[PDB]
From a paper:
The present work focuses on the group A endonuclease (DNase) colicin, ColE9, a member of the E group of colicins (ColE2‐E9), all of which use the same import machinery but target different nucleic acids in the cytoplasm (DNA, rRNA or tRNAs). At its N‐terminus is an 83 amino acid intrinsically unstructured translocation domain (IUTD) that houses three protein‐protein interaction epitopes (Housden et al, 2010); a 16‐residue TolB‐binding epitope (TBE) associates with the periplasmic protein TolB which is flanked by two OmpF‐binding sites (OBS1 and OBS2). Escherichia coli porins OmpF and OmpC are abundant trimeric β‐barrel outer membrane proteins with narrow channels running through them that taper to an eyelet, 7–8 Å at the narrowest point. Tol‐dependent colicins assemble a translocon at the cell surface that involves its periplasmic target along with the OM receptor and translocator which together establish the import pathway of the toxin.
Numbering used by the authors:
A (entry chain B), D (entry chain C), E (entry chain A): 1 to 340
B (entry chain D): 3 to 67, 85 to 125, 132 to 314
C (entry chain E): 33 to 44, 49 to 430
Write the structure that this text describes.
């Protein structure tokens, strides 16, 4: 909500609480998502200020706190800062920001990530360009300098991050994304390329230095309807873990397909359907395998913008004989949300 | 990093509060008597507590923010950087060891334990672990440690706990039968309450901790055995070659009895064949002389 | 309904519409129906010009005419004549002429309103009287103002501004002081502020609410409610000595006192019977008697100046309205039909009641004639208006 | 404070700062509470929105940050999320919420927990029903559907939590609570029962599976006075730690008694008195023992609702010879509070 | 920004986001500051309330969240609470506060700490009186009871803190500070003394118990100009680390000199210059050495109070042969800031 809008400065504090639970057969080790209480609250602030008629500056920050944890040593587990960046928006040329923000590729993957709780599984966090990461400098242009309506393009540089684990580390990277919105229809295409650090190469899985991602997205949103289809291909970018070997690394090749179809009703209802799939190829010692292959069937009741309830039933089509130990069981999640 | 900005020295205050200062919290409900029947209480109040209660009450539930080893039972102590850790008890030594020491009173000795590196390394692969043993000083020494000059560094003892090499194993055992006498060292205290640091020449820092609260325990480690056979046998010529013991005394205002502690190295099997060899050569000598 | 009457525009654009003010005053009382200006048979500028037959034909037996003329110093002379058009056609029943500065032109109208109303009714006029009330404005520093205006909402001025809750102003019987509740200290206090100089006398600051002041008609005492004992009970202060006596003491609740004409008895609201009802008690001998038995709830009482009736807020079957109960019969008549009808206050002549309602979402006070015949909104204020209080004769 | 009240939605940001210190003889190892600086700041947001005249939705979240810690590796010590839940309140039937919230039994124990800093020691956190825990679904009825005034009853289900330690873990549980308020007097009764996980049974102390708690509370609040008396009994529910053995677990049986008497003055003062006791029975190897047995003597000056100061002197009656190593020393705490 | 100013209470929520990066030759091990992304967001609340005309109470809290970290195990690295205290300001006598706040000596060191990102290196955190620490009780007088204008004096007691490391620990301490502001010129003098804990003495470096700091500061601020010069001397107070030995401790003696000169322009610009030096003496086995010796050259564009950009180039004059492993390389930092 907008709490302070004065002196040519406006602040929108946005925060929410989510009472959530995941049900699954058994203890929940083999469940797609898990099992138990996953309640969480997020807090964040967005701020803008028109320095001039043609120039405004903005800053945004978001944090996530988990309530499922106890008050002991595990209180901080799952607690983090999602977004923390700043930037400036000129009148027409565009806008430039820096900090910890979503990667350009997520823009394409944004179309499918409309599900209540699950969705966007391919868009892993702390990954090169698919998810939200720290150390990015992004420039964005709206309507190509106002020349052509609906054509927004952006570019992003990724500063190297040398962390303890290859899963969370990266290096110098670049990327771009284009989006054309016409008459309700929407099309997008994004590409990102970066260099893997030595720690990443040292991992048993994964081979090569150029970690590459790219994606194409299509959608149509209107008349209380939302259709979306994202097809993405990557090399040495997707993380993979083997329970049998208890060893992790990255995928030599990956194809990902996401499809979403949601209808909305006047009386605060929104049924949703989602298909998903991700196939890894040229895996070291595992040939080709499917990481995720499932259907979604869910719904969301919107009492209002600030209050909502939702359910999601995940029909995991993954087979038990999978050569990586990926969960071959179904799952369900039920959530309630308040947000200001 | 630019924190100095502002940060006025002296009293810090802002400018222009909206309302005049209230006397206190004498009127809690509002600008009302708290009554509520007539329109004097809650004549302005609106939407008082429509929501259900959320954690009604203060909610400050609580507030913001060494089992002892029995005397005479050799056990492994893995060292730390701060030295070895030992926790003694007050309870006097069990019938077993008193028995042994009485029998032995009237160089020979009696084997308490036997060591097996094969096993000791399963838990302590680096072979850093030592073997500590402790007795109450008065049961060892004829002259009580209290009634002793502070100048004396070596008190005489009637028995000692010593590493020996017999039947192809190293073993910890209680020796006696000759004039013997051991280091006497004072135990400096430390930050922790009832926790001191004795330092015996040639061992690590032996930080002690008295405890007569927990019931005494006997620790059981796959390497260290408890050889039932308690016959008195002749002892090693090389007895003690990897042992450091000492009577340790506490400061007068502690009320802790003086304690004897031996700390023996765990020999590897090569070093045990070596000790065995030297022992056989010395037995040869003694046999010819 | 009401007596039909002809009210003629005054002979002069004129600085003020005196005839319109007289018509509006007479109408607000409920007792008169000034003839629609568009249907007047003539607009005589003088009594001589009145044609009685033309007014009697329309059922009008009296006609108000007058003159406003400017004086060399910029002031104005206002004159009125009341011409019989009934049994004594063309005769002037009453008249006057007098000099006022422009800033009293509206008062001039009320003066005429006061006389004709009395001449034709025999009742002293209350059109030159004032009302007091509390406004919660949209200003930040002093959102609470105790204000006074003319009875009809014109000529408003502020008597006191406060950053904290104000309640329940009350006029001294001479119209020179207002008692009221102020919370500027952070809790309740009862104070008397002199209007002429704004001086504030501290009346009570007991540990809890000090509220619902009422001046005795004779001016010697102030009634109010204190909960220091633990609950609201009635107390009276002798204004000369400042000594405080308790009037009610018990587990029942007694508050919102209003004085009877005798300056010895109070009517007030009590929950002794469950839902609020009106009780009567002597300020000396304390033993309250319930006097409201109609409806399902009765509260916020005001005793008439002759003591024959009171007005109050009564709840009957879901509907809460301003009602009038005859004090010697108990007969209840619902007067108001607005929503959230609250805090009525009676004119000193018993002819009009001012009260607050949902009108203007709280920002408007309303007048209703005590015959029930006329209802109107006052001019809108720049805030939320509560706790209206009708001055004594001024 | 209420910062945003618009569009049928209202937000009350509530946060406070507490400059606190604990004094005790010696280093403070044996002190009841401890010793040193215990300053802490809490931040939280509550939000409501009337979807309909008869239906409103609410969400609440609270976090605690400790200032006593340094800026090094120990910054996060003692930092946690206390409450994070959501729920809906229908007009008359009642209200239903889910998340991380207080257990039904705390309602009874709420009467005694009126002390400035200490108090409610029996109401441990991350315990089955006595303290605030995650994974609860609670329904509450006010005035029994509006039939009888002052009679509020509630029921609570507790989803299983499989954590690393038995102290913070639980299993499926149920509970209920009833409260009758009449003429100022108040009476309450609460009961909770759940199953202990295997990890809990494996602990050296504690025996049995059915972890049971129940409590009865009485109070009178009026005329600037507050009297309260809570008597609670539990089986295999209360945690216990032995310094001599350096081993923990749960109590086979426990009785707890709490008594509070506070008077309030018009001039922003509130003296308080509190008696407390907890006796464990059928302890493994320790027979019967007293965990806590002390008096309180304290006070609180309320400059206003948003500013307060307080003091609490804890007369620990515990003897040194206690067979668990519990502190047998007195303690005192002095605190200053700002809160909006 | 002031969000709630009602009921004689006023709340100023202040928070900011900083997109930051540090550039340096090589990996950045030898760089003065470091290298990579150092973006961070701070959130805090200040609150006041006039209890009486002559008495007001205030509470302040601040936290820092780092965005450079990932969402894995290292999320909390560098996350902390800077300030958390409370206090009361009487009309004339002065003001008294307690909690986690700046030490009196920082007041003198405040003059030089006007740089955009770097600066105030001597004012280490969790140190006795130079930086912000927990467990302080401070009293302050403004204008010496209103007798003499511009003369503010304060005094501070430091409760002992027994932490795991000597670097973050302290003991009982005392200090005082005086500040005379006349006609734009400003002068200050501060002194602090405390006892070192046993853990501190046990460290290989450092000798003695009385840890002492003191400082003198001068400044002139006017006409869009800011000059400042702080000279401080300390014993057994400054921390020092030896990479060659990989051992730390404190400095037997230290002299520190700071000089700042900043000019400001009407068109939102602020060039800055800063000289700095710190020399340790009587070091155990290292004689006398220089910890830091560098120039600053930087600038700051102030689009407005709520939005700013800045740059700082650090000319490290330190030589490579330094006997402690201190970085002998230059550095640069570029930052963008939004703040409400």
């Amino acid at each position: 909500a907008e709490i302070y809008n004065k002196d040519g400065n406006k602040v929108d504090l946005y925060g929410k609480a989510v009472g959530l639970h995941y049900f699954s057969k058994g203890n929940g080790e083999n469940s797609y998502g898990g099992n138990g209480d996953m309640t969480y609250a997020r807090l964040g602030f967005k701020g803008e200020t028109q320095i001039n008629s043609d120039l405004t500056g903005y800053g945004q920050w978001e944090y996530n706190f988990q309530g499922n944890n106890s008050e002991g040593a595990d209180a901080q587990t799952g607690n983090k800062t999602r977004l923390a960046f700043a930037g400036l928006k000129y009148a027409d040329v565009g806008s430039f920001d820096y900090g910890r923000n979503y990667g350009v590729v997520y823009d394409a993957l944004g179309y499918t990530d409309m599900l209540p709780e699950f969705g966007g599984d391919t868009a892993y966090s702390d990954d090169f360009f698919v998810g939200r990461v720290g150390g990015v400098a992004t420039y964005r242009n709206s309507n190509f300098f106002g020349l052509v309506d609906g054509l927004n393009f952006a570019v992003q540089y990724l500063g190297k991050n040398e962390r303890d684990t290859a899963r969370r580390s990266n290096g110098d990277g670049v990327g771009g994304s284009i989006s054309y919105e016409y008459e309700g229809f929407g099309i997008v295409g994004a590409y990102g390329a970066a260099d893997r650090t030595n720690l990443q190469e040292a991992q048993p899985l994964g081979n090569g230095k150029k970690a590459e991602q790219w994606a194409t997205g299509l959608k149509y949103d209107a008349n209380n309807i939302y259709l979306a289809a994202n097809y993405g291909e990557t090399r040495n970018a997707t993380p993979i873990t083997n329970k049998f070997t208890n060893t992790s690394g990255f995928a030599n090749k990956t194809q990902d397909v996401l499809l979403v179809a949601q209808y909305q009703f006047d009386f605060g209802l929104r049924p949703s359907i989602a298909y998903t799939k991700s196939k890894a190829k040229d895996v070291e010692g595992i040939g080709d395998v499917d990481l995720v292959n499932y259907f979604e069937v869910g719904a969301t009741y919107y009492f209002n913008k600030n209050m909502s309830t939702y359910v999601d039933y995940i029909i995991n089509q993954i087979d038990s004989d999978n050569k990586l130990g990926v969960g071959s069981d179904d799952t369900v999640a039920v959530g309630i949300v308040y947000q200001f | 990093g630019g924190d100095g900005r502002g940060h006025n020295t002296g009293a810090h205050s802002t400018s222009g509060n909206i309302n005049g200062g209230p006397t206190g919290i004498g009127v809690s409900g509002g600008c009302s008597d708290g009554s509520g029947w007539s329109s004097e209480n809650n004549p302005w109040g609106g939407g008082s507590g429509s929501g259900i209660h959320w954690g009604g009450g203060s909610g400050r539930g609580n507030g913001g923010g060494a089992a002892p080893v029995a005397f005479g039972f050799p056990a492994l102590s893995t060292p730390g950087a701060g030295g070895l850790a030992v926790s003694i008890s007050a309870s006097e030594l069990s019938a077993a060891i008193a028995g042994i020491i009485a029998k032995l009173k009237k160089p020979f000795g009696v084997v308490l334990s036997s060591l097996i590196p094969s096993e000791i390394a399963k838990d302590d692969p680096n072979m850093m672990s030592k073997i500590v043993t402790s007795l109450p000083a008065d049961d060892i020494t004829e002259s009580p440690v209290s009634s002793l000059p502070l100048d004396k560094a070596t008190v005489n003892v009637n028995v000692r706990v010593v590493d020996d090499v017999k039947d192809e194993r190293q073993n910890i055992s209680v020796v006696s039968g000759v004039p013997m006498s051991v280091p006497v060292v004072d135990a400096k205290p430390t930050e922790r309450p009832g926790v001191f640091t004795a330092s015996i020449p040639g061992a690590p820092v032996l930080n002690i901790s008295v405890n007569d609260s927990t019931p005494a325990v006997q620790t059981l480690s796959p390497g260290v055995t408890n050889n039932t056979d308690k016959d008195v046998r002749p002892a090693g010529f090389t007895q003690g070659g990897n042992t450091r013991d000492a009577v340790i005394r506490f400061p007068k205002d502690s009320g802790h009895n003086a304690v004897y502690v031996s700390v023996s190295d765990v020999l590897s099997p090569d070093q045990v064949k070596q000790r065995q060899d030297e022992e056989n050569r010395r037995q040869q000598e003694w046999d010819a002389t | 309904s009401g007596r039909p009457i002809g009210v003629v525009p005054f002979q002069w654009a004129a600085p003020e519409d005196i005839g319109g003010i007289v018509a509006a005053d007479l109408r607000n009382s409920g007792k008169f129906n000034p003839l629609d200006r568009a249907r007047l048979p003539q607009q005589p500028g003088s009594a001589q010009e009145v044609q009685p037959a033309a007014w009697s034909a329309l059922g009008i037996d009296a006609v108000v005419v007058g003159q406003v003329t400017p004086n060399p110093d910029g002031s104005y002379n206002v004159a009125y004549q009341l011409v019989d058009t009934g049994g004594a056609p063309g005769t002037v029943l009453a008249q006057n002429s007098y000099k006022v500065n422009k800033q009293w032109l509206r008062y001039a109208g009320h003066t005429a309103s006061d006389e004709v109303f009395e001449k034709l009714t025999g009742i002293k006029g209350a059109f030159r009287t004032r009302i007091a009330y509390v406004v919660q404005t949209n200003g930040g520093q002093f959102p609470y103002e105790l204000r006074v205006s003319d009875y009809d909402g014109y000529n408003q001025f502020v008597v006191h501004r406060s950053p904290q809750c104000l309640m329940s102003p009350a006029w001294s019987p001479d119209g020179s002081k207002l008692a009221y509740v102020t919370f500027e200290s952070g809790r309740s206090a009862l104070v008397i502020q002199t209007l002429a100089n704004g001086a504030v006398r501290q009346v009570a600051s007991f540990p809890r609410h000090n509220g619902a002041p009422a001046f005795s008609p004779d001016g010697s005492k102030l009634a109010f409610a204190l909960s220091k004992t633990g609950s609201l009970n009635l107390y009276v202060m002798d204004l000369a000595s400042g000594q405080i006596r308790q009037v009610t003491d018990g587990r029942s609740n007694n508050t919102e006192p209003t004085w009877f004409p005798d300056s010895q008895n109070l009517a007030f609201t009590s929950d002794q019977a469950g839902r609020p009802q009106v009780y009567k008690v002597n300020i000396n001998g304390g033993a309250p008697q319930r006097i409201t038995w109609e409806g399902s709830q009765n509260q916020d009482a005001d005793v008439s100046s002759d003591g024959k009736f009171m007005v109050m807020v009564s709840s009957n079957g879901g509907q809460q309205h301003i009602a009038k109960q005859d004090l010697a019969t108990g007969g209840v008549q619902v007067l108001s039909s607005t929503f959230l009808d609250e805090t009525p206050s009676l004119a000193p002549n018993g002819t009009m009641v001012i009260y607050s309602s949902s009108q203007g979402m709280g920002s408007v006070l309303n007048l209703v004639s005590t015959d029930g015949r006329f209802k109107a909104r006052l001019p809108a204020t720049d805030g939320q208006v509560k706790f209206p209080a009708w001055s004594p004769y001024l």
